[PDB]
Design a protein around this motif. Structure first.
Motif, PDB file in Angstrom:
ATOM      1  N   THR A  78       0.846  -1.134   0.000  1.00  0.00           N
ATOM      2  CA  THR A  78       0.000   0.000   0.000  1.00  0.00           C
ATOM      3  C   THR A  78       0.899   1.206   0.000  1.00  0.00           C
ATOM      4  OG1 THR A  78      -0.292   0.389   2.392  1.00  0.00           O
ATOM      5  CG2 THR A  78      -1.895  -1.103   1.219  1.00  0.00           C
ATOM      6  N   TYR A  79       0.378   2.296  -0.579  1.00  0.00           N
ATOM      7  CA  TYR A  79       1.131   3.524  -0.736  1.00  0.00           C
ATOM      8  C   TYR A  79       0.330   4.646  -0.193  1.00  0.00           C
ATOM      9  CZ  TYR A  79       4.162   0.601  -3.298  1.00  0.00           C
ATOM     10  OH  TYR A  79       5.060  -0.355  -3.534  1.00  0.00           O
ATOM     11  N   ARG A  80       0.759   5.080   0.964  1.00  0.00           N
ATOM     12  CA  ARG A  80      -0.027   6.050   1.691  1.00  0.00           C
ATOM     13  C   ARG A  80       0.614   7.347   1.661  1.00  0.00           C
ATOM     14  NH1 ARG A  80      -0.494   7.318   7.137  1.00  0.00           N
ATOM     15  NH2 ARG A  80       1.265   6.000   7.683  1.00  0.00           N
ATOM     16  N   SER A  81      -0.167   8.448   1.431  1.00  0.00           N
ATOM     17  CA  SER A  81       0.472   9.770   1.356  1.00  0.00           C
ATOM     18  C   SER A  81       1.160  10.296   2.657  1.00  0.00           C
ATOM     19  CB  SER A  81      -0.432  10.825   0.746  1.00  0.00           C
ATOM     20  OG  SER A  81       0.086  12.118   1.073  1.00  0.00           O
ATOM     21  N   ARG A  82       2.433  10.581   2.592  1.00  0.00           N
ATOM     22  CA  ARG A  82       3.123  11.080   3.742  1.00  0.00           C
ATOM     23  C   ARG A  82       2.631  12.433   4.168  1.00  0.00           C
ATOM     24  NH1 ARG A  82       9.054  12.510   3.060  1.00  0.00           N
ATOM     25  NH2 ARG A  82       7.851  14.442   3.524  1.00  0.00           N
ATOM     26  N   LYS A  83       2.065  13.222   3.263  1.00  0.00           N
ATOM     27  CA  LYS A  83       1.509  14.536   3.586  1.00  0.00           C
ATOM     28  C   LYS A  83       0.035  14.401   4.040  1.00  0.00           C
ATOM     29  CE  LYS A  83       1.934  19.323   1.861  1.00  0.00           C
ATOM     30  NZ  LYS A  83       3.288  19.605   1.354  1.00  0.00           N
ATOM     31  N   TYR A  84      -0.845  13.862   3.143  1.00  0.00           N
ATOM     32  CA  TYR A  84      -2.274  13.647   3.280  1.00  0.00           C
ATOM     33  C   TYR A  84      -2.534  12.213   3.853  1.00  0.00           C
ATOM     34  CZ  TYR A  84      -1.272  17.676   0.207  1.00  0.00           C
ATOM     35  OH  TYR A  84      -0.690  18.869  -0.247  1.00  0.00           O
ATOM     36  N   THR A  85      -1.977  12.068   5.041  1.00  0.00           N
ATOM     37  CA  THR A  85      -1.849  10.845   5.867  1.00  0.00           C
ATOM     38  C   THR A  85      -2.906   9.769   5.931  1.00  0.00           C
ATOM     39  OG1 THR A  85      -1.836  11.798   8.081  1.00  0.00           O
ATOM     40  CG2 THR A  85       0.286  11.753   6.986  1.00  0.00           C
ATOM     41  N   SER A  86      -4.152  10.019   5.542  1.00  0.00           N
ATOM     42  CA  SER A  86      -5.138   8.915   5.532  1.00  0.00           C
ATOM     43  C   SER A  86      -5.483   8.432   4.100  1.00  0.00           C
ATOM     44  CB  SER A  86      -6.392   9.212   6.328  1.00  0.00           C
ATOM     45  OG  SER A  86      -6.673  10.584   6.236  1.00  0.00           O
ATOM     46  N   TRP A  87      -4.787   9.037   3.112  1.00  0.00           N
ATOM     47  CA  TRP A  87      -4.965   8.843   1.690  1.00  0.00           C
ATOM     48  C   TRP A  87      -3.946   7.955   1.059  1.00  0.00           C
ATOM     49  CZ3 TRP A  87      -6.203  14.556   0.194  1.00  0.00           C
ATOM     50  CH2 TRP A  87      -7.326  14.931   0.943  1.00  0.00           C
ATOM     51  N   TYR A  88      -4.467   7.041   0.220  1.00  0.00           N
ATOM     52  CA  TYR A  88      -3.653   6.101  -0.491  1.00  0.00           C
ATOM     53  C   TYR A  88      -3.720   6.269  -1.975  1.00  0.00           C
ATOM     54  CZ  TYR A  88      -4.066   3.283   3.615  1.00  0.00           C
ATOM     55  OH  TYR A  88      -4.033   2.843   4.902  1.00  0.00           O
ATOM     56  N   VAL A  89      -2.624   5.826  -2.611  1.00  0.00           N
ATOM     57  CA  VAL A  89      -2.546   5.690  -4.017  1.00  0.00           C
ATOM     58  C   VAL A  89      -3.474   4.489  -4.315  1.00  0.00           C
ATOM     59  CG1 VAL A  89      -1.138   4.971  -5.825  1.00  0.00           C
ATOM     60  CG2 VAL A  89      -0.214   6.534  -4.068  1.00  0.00           C
ATOM     61  N   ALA A  90      -4.353   4.651  -5.291  1.00  0.00           N
ATOM     62  CA  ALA A  90      -5.299   3.633  -5.622  1.00  0.00           C
ATOM     63  C   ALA A  90      -5.914   3.783  -7.031  1.00  0.00           C
ATOM     64  CB  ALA A  90      -6.415   3.666  -4.554  1.00  0.00           C
ATOM     65  N   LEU A  91      -6.451   2.686  -7.571  1.00  0.00           N
ATOM     66  CA  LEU A  91      -7.080   2.685  -8.859  1.00  0.00           C
ATOM     67  C   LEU A  91      -8.440   2.040  -8.746  1.00  0.00           C
ATOM     68  CD1 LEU A  91      -4.339   1.269 -11.310  1.00  0.00           C
ATOM     69  CD2 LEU A  91      -5.090   3.617 -10.966  1.00  0.00           C
ATOM     70  N   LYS A  92      -9.418   2.651  -9.415  1.00  0.00           N
ATOM     71  CA  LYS A  92     -10.781   2.149  -9.523  1.00  0.00           C
ATOM     72  C   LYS A  92     -10.817   0.964 -10.499  1.00  0.00           C
ATOM     73  CE  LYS A  92     -13.943   5.104  -9.644  1.00  0.00           C
ATOM     74  NZ  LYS A  92     -14.554   5.634  -8.397  1.00  0.00           N
ATOM     75  N   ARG A  93     -11.857   0.160 -10.378  1.00  0.00           N
ATOM     76  CA  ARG A  93     -12.011  -0.981 -11.257  1.00  0.00           C
ATOM     77  C   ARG A  93     -12.082  -0.561 -12.744  1.00  0.00           C
ATOM     78  NH1 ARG A  93     -16.635  -1.211 -10.766  1.00  0.00           N
ATOM     79  NH2 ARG A  93     -16.676   0.781  -9.549  1.00  0.00           N
ATOM     80  N   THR A  94     -12.273   0.726 -12.985  1.00  0.00           N
ATOM     81  CA  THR A  94     -12.349   1.235 -14.337  1.00  0.00           C
ATOM     82  C   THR A  94     -10.984   1.615 -14.924  1.00  0.00           C
ATOM     83  OG1 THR A  94     -12.471   3.542 -13.610  1.00  0.00           O
ATOM     84  CG2 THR A  94     -14.564   2.316 -13.785  1.00  0.00           C
ATOM     85  N   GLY A  95      -9.928   1.488 -14.128  1.00  0.00           N
ATOM     86  CA  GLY A  95      -8.642   1.883 -14.635  1.00  0.00           C
ATOM     87  C   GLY A  95      -8.389   3.363 -14.414  1.00  0.00           C
TER      88      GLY A  95
END
Length: 129
Positions: A88-105
Motif C-alpha cells: 500500500t502507498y499512503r500519502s506522507r503529507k495527506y496521511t489517511s490517503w492512499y494511491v489507488a485505482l478504480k475498477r475502471t482503470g
C-alpha cells in the motif's frame, strides 16, 4: 535498485504515468509508461517515478493524483507490506490517503480511499537493465 511495475489488485491494472503528468492505469504490461522507479527516500518512504515520463507520482490536497516534473513533498508515500502481502502507498503529507485505482482503470480519488479496499492494494513486479 531496478525498474518495476505496480500491479493493482483492483481489476488487475498497472499504475501508469504519462509524459504530460496524467496518471491512470492499464492492463498492457508492455506499455513503457508503466515502468516505475521506486526510490527509498527513507525508511518506509518512497518517491514513485515514471521512467519514460521522467515525472514523480504526486498526491494533492484535494485527493488528486498527478505526475510532476518536480520532486516535492507531495511526492512521498509510506510503503507498507500489508498482512495479505500486498503493498500500500499512503500519502506522507495527506496521511489517511492512499494511491489507488478504480475498477475502471481510472485512479481513485485520495479522499475516497481507506483500509479494506481493493483499490489500494498493489503488487510490485520486476527488476532489470
Amino acid at each position: 535498485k531496478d525498474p518495476k511495475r505496480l500491479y493493482c489488485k483492483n481489476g488487475g491494472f498497472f499504475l501508469r504515468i504519462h509524459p504530460d503528468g496524467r496518471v491512470d492505469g492499464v492492463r498492457e504490461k508492455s506499455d513503457p509508461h508503466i515502468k516505475l522507479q521506486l526510490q527509498a527516500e527513507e525508511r518506509g518512504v518512497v518517491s514513485i517515478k515514471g521512467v519514460c515520463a521522467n515525472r514523480y507520482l504526486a498526491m494533492k490536497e484535494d485527493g488528486r493524483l498527478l505526475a510532476s516534473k518536480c520532486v516535492t513533498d507531495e511526492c512521498f508515500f509510506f510503503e507498507r507490506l500489508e498482512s495479505n502481502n500486498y503493498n500500500t502507498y499512503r500519502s506522507r503529507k495527506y496521511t489517511s490517503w492512499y494511491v489507488a485505482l478504480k475498477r475502471t482503470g481510472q485512479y481513485k480519488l485520495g479522499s475516497k480511499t481507506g483500509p479494506g479496499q481493493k483499490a489500494i492494494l498493489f503488487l510490485p513486479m520486476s527488476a532489470k537493465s
